[PDB]
Design a protein around this ligand. Structure first.
Ligand SMILES: [Ca+2]
Length: 172
């Protein structure tokens, strides 16, 4: 995924008289864990091609409490990934956030390094939860970066996916 400029700094103010969108959200997994004996255990990524989900986008709606809700409306729908257990079993997964609806804390006056988005997604047989932890904001450009954690049930397994993300926020 893209990265922020090395001098990126500040907060990204949110004008309550305007409406906003996520123009691009890219999720780059760094870890796939699969439940075995009740424990999420690490697996090795086998897929050599890109595993990132990119181009995710949609409105950021305002709720009655000043929180923002991101509604995914377009983007790459899924990425097929294969991971390998320690003992050699290869497991195909579809990494996705299709139909994501995710909200921030109340009283959004600016996107900062303490902003979080939490929500759920669901597509076909997968039901999932994800948290986006913003870690860096470029207030000039609307670019943000952070880490994410998702949990879902893809292909008969319970899977946790974690990684880094990049996003760009802008007025409608
Ligand atoms: Ca944070």
């Amino acid at each position: 995924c893209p990265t922020l400029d090395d001098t990126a700094r500040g907060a990204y103010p949110i004008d309550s008289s305007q409406t906003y969108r996520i123009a691009r959200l890219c999720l780059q997994p760094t870890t796939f864990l699969v439940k075995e004996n009740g424990e999420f255990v690490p697996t090795k990524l086998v897929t050599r091609e890109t595993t990132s989900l990119d181009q995710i986008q949609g409105e950021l709606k305002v709720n009655s409490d000043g929180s923002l809700t991101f509604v995914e409306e377009d983007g790459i729908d899924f990425q097929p990934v294969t991971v390998q257990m320690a003992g050699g079993e290869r497991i195909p997964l579809l990494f996705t956030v299709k139909n994501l609806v995710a909200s921030t804390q109340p009283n959004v006056t600016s996107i900062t390094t303490s902003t979080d988005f939490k929500g759920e997604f669901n597509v076909n047989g997968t039901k999932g939860q994800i948290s986006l932890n913003v870690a860096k904001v470029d207030g000039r450009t609307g670019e943000i970066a952070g880490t994410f954690e998702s949990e879902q049930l893809s292909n008969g397994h319970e899977v946790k996916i974690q990684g880094v993300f990049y996003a760009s926020i802008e007025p409608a």
